[model samples]
Target chain A: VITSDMIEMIFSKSPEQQLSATQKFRKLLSKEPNPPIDEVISTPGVVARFVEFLKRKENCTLQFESAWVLTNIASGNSLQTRIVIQAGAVPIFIELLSSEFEDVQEQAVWALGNIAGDSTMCRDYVLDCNILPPLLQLFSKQNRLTMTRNAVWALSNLCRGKSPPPEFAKVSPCLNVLSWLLFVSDTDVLADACWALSYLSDGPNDKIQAVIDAGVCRRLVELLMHNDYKVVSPALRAVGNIVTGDDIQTQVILNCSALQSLLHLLSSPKESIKKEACWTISNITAGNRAQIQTVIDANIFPALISILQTAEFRTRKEAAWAITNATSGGSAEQIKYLVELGCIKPLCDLLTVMDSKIVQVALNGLENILRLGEQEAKRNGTGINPYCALIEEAYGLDKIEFLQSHENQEIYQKAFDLIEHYFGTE
Target chain B: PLGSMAKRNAEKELTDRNWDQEDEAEEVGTFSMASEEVLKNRAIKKAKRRN
Candidate 1:
């Protein structure tokens, strides 16, 4: 009879009481949903004892559970994560990933994955710990579906961008793993695998092809076509990542025939679907013409252009901006196409106002066109000197002060100088 | 300093129902961190805290 109350009793104990009680609590959280954080970390000695728990329990069930609690705490903030690692908690985390108990192993992988997110030091930590073996081993298991999925996700998160050389790592293993998970696994696992692929393949052509050659493309196309919107958006993003050049130039889209599927998403009843589809098109078609031709042929731009003019929703505006980005990757032809399609004046409106993300995307679209046309647009003539005068006359001091600090300070070191340059005030 | 900016941020955004996000926003807006002298005087009797 496992219960949350029973687990809590074991967890909220003095340092001496923590060692034995932890096993009960650890077993409880997996089945339990969203246990309170403060209550778990309050366990006086769980972090410290897990250090030694690894030594006594070589198989790592307890270590796995302990890692879950520790990772949750660490992920929640810099202090808990820092203190736990400093307290020798990382060694236990590494060992737990190498554990034999299936759930325990899965949880350990998850723990590392959750903790590593957004922490700059995460990749180095995983690499140094040599956590890759356990990760690779889990994937090889035919039966440990959940465990394997969690491990791959963790490894991908650990491997996300930067730290070069191995980022691409020839791409075969990832593609092979992706195909197995994509076509053979259940829906949830496929979704997770696609997500992992998204993080790993988000960069360049060769990187994107790794997923394509290994055959993630066909499965992704099928999933995007699913009526379920949850699966549709991620699939659109994944397909878009690899399909940016010409459909034929990149065999993935050509092989799978994903363009019609991507175009259809823009007309999706679900706004979220439409928005993400727009992102997919923009990202993959960013610097190519054929990709643009596909969307233009799909005829989604009319609605996208309308949304640019009228939609107050940020996502809707963003989708329209993405359309401008996809078709007009900064070419005179593309800009003229946008103008002909009635997208230019509205886009220019956004650029004139400029604070809106709508304007930013539209501005980027225009900039791309101007660059292609060999136009130097930055600092066109006079700076913000006159505009500052109007802003000063209109906005209250507090609001203006907030604006100045918000804009200049965080982005660059010379924020104060920029402020003076604009206002020319003492 | 800890509470002021976050409070200001929430006031500006006006959407935060959760205390933590509200608190984080407040902390960020503190870069304008009121004049240090003003802060010191406010807390002089107790011990100045950088609110």
Candidate 2:
């Protein structure tokens, strides 16, 4: 039953009055009344008033409750979140990161986490507001479990929007902080730390190398086997991002039991676990022959084929990508191994899908299969003609021939290349 | 002369067509990996998910 006037009473000079006002305000916001409290809290000047309370150093009680209220307002929607941002709450929240009061700082981190978790603009606002210093300082104390957790969550949110990972990530010890946090017993902490590392690893060579060199890849591989999928998913996800980097980084992962661990995950009954594992393999196959050979030595070819034969569309597409990449840069033996394991049938089955990328990767694999066959026969004095016949027997000449003039231009041309080379028209 | 494999396909095309040892040049010392657009997109999306 509280209105804007009642909410304003929270700024009362008397501590008792302030305490009573906060309790009533909390109660008003907590209830799911017909007329939403969000509309009242978000009135034109209401949010700015909260920001002012957060900025005023005189009242810790008022500042803490205001931050809490603002956090809930941000939780409503991006539109309400934008109003909070426009009211200039970011810097005040950043300043509050150093509050000696545990709950006050916790609410501060919570507020910024929601704001940074908003749109690109809000995330950038939090990033540019110089919040990292105090936030990291708060996180470093590590005495208050709730505050430390909230601080890591806030940083994880900041890392989300930095696609190429801002240069600040280099000097900030973000990787080191997350790496140390990974040692703790809390799954929630591990989850956020792993999530932050995933974002950090998602960038270019320098950023990824930084995270890997910080001993992240090895620990992430360990975390991949966690009992909790909450931890396992992001942990596997972070490993996937690192492997997506250059050769040395992928090798670090492969050397640290990542390849074997990921292959083990392929048999997991969980689709998410399977997809993340396949995704990591897909990235590993993106490497050159030696790297692809490393994957083959891990004996992943059959598993990928198995996924293509039975998994859902997304997982199958990832399998297709792994197979396609494997064959693309693969040695003659590697190509033969995949084809011998019956990749061609599954690849042909994939051709029926309408997805252009999947179709293109499969077409590339089929093209390589035929070309590698041609090269091998020429080397061994075997006939190339039967090789083509074998392929046509597996997936008839009529089927591939139908793709010659397919609607997708790239598919049309790649399919043309396959038929031309295989049919000996080239 | 052939159409590209989605533009992000590996340099395997060069090695596939020619007997160029330049493709295997990296094999002399350290190892290397191929990159794909789809892989990059997946990495980006994985990092972008909410808590």
Candidate 3:
């Protein structure tokens, strides 16, 4: 947050100062949330500013910082993310991606990744223009861990959970080019591969199954044991997302059980993985009840429950509401167990919740729960009291007192079974 | 004169189109995986993705 003036004073006229400013400015691209002083920082202006910086008269002193700041501004913000692309930054950044300097290449890749996001159209745009080959070329040339990582992260994020355009497919020439990177790149690059593959793996079962059969599953398995929990966790989440797509001819659950690992990552050591794991689990269990029970047996429920109780509120609330959704497929007894594990009031509170995402999750959970039955009691002979639990816990449940008897009874049984099933039996 | 030029163009085009065994052209070596077609496809495909 220090002023550029202070930066200049401390780093005064020395090579060290120049390099220091370069690194500081470049790294702060991700850290600075506030906009710079130019024309209120509209996305196009931010991008134009970078183009302008690229044209700056370079002193060896200023060249590095200019490149660094330009890369920073280009890569970090979504608004600027597109403008930089629109302003002919692509060809220039591609040059930087292959730059002799590791720092410039890293920043270029970061910018490219932010722009591509998970949209295949954008990814195809990148590839169609031959941007991808240079990114791949970085692996061969940069020879540094961080540069390779930045390149991989950008490519992976762009491809994550989306298909690559025909351009990517063709430029890759053979499957081996991509597959090799997927299998043999650094752990970070490998993680990026999984993220990229997630988007493409959503096709027909046979094609999807064939890729699994080609042995990416083993690679995913290797990721489970990754020493860096950070890499292992996203990798697992990526596998879950990619392997469980809708159209595939081969059933992934049978072929590799990406779902199994996805559920396992709920207990991952890293918080980020747990968050991703929660999302992946929700995706897999959104509609199927049988899968929900299998997920529970994997012992994912406890971690999710724990996360809800102890983790940050957003993640916790999300996990809780997600359980409500998954258990919708459960038998009458299932809903009761969710409540027994302390779901009812929280769920009701969640259902009436203000956040649209949470409310949607609660509504989905209710739709599923209400389908099973209104008066189904838990196997433990205790009735589910979801309404009361919502009222009692979650900082008081006096809010939804107007429920008719039928609705209350339906919610009650759901609460009871939810609790008793999870707490008592499993 | 222009017709004569057209006649010359036709002759040149025909000669160029003809295959020459003595030119050792088809002997462009046995096809491996990286043929001209394959390389052209790769580059063209990459270009199309841009669209």
Give the DockQ of candidate 3.
0.01
The positional error of residue B7 in candidate 1, measured at the CA in angstroms, is 40
Cα error of candidate 1 at position A318, Å: 5.4
Clashes of 1: 8
Q: CA RMSD for every model? A: 14.3, 12.2, 24.0
lDDT of 2 by residue, A1-426 (tens): 656556566555665666566656655565554426556664556667667878757677778777877776676589878777888888888888776677777888888888877656677778788877777777566456777778788877777744434555433466678898898898878888887887776656677787877887778999888888678877887787777676666888888878888888999887767866887888888776787898998988889988987877767877888888888877777888888898888877656455655666767777778788788776776455334555666663545555554555555566555665567342
Alpha-carbon runs more than 4 Å astray in model 1: A1-19, A23-46, A57-75, A159-175, A243-251, A283-292, A299-426, B1-51
Models ranked on lDDT: 2, 1, 3
DockQ of 2: 0.02
In the order shown, the candidates' DockQ scores are 0.02, 0.02, 0.01
**TM-scores for every predicted model:** 0.57, 0.81, 0.49
Best by TM-score: 2
The 0-to-1 C-alpha lDDT of every candidate, in the order given, reads 0.52, 0.69, 0.49
Against the true structure, whose lDDT is highest? 2
Which run of 10 residues does model 1 chain A get worst, by summed lDDT?
A406-415
The residue-by-residue lDDT of candidate 1 on A1-426, one tens digit each, is 444554454456453345456655555444445645555556566466555555545534455556665665566567677767776766666676665576666776777776555354755565567666656667775756667667666755664544342435533345566667777546566665666665555555566666666766777788888765545655665665555433353545644666577667666776656655655555444435655555566665666776655444544555554555553443446555655675544554443232433434544554344343333223353322222332333332223233233322332222233234333334
Over the stretch A1-426, how does candidate 3's per-residue lDDT look in tens digits?
546553453345564555565555455554566635242233234335445444323333344465556555555555555555677776666666655556666766776666665255566666656667777777665366776667666665444432233433443332233465666546666655655554334444434554564456556655765666545744554354443454232135424555556566666655555655665565444445565666666656666766765555445544764586566556666566665576544455554443434544554565445444335434334655233333345432222221111122443333334333322222
Write the candidate numbers in order of decreasing TM-score.
Answer: 2, 1, 3
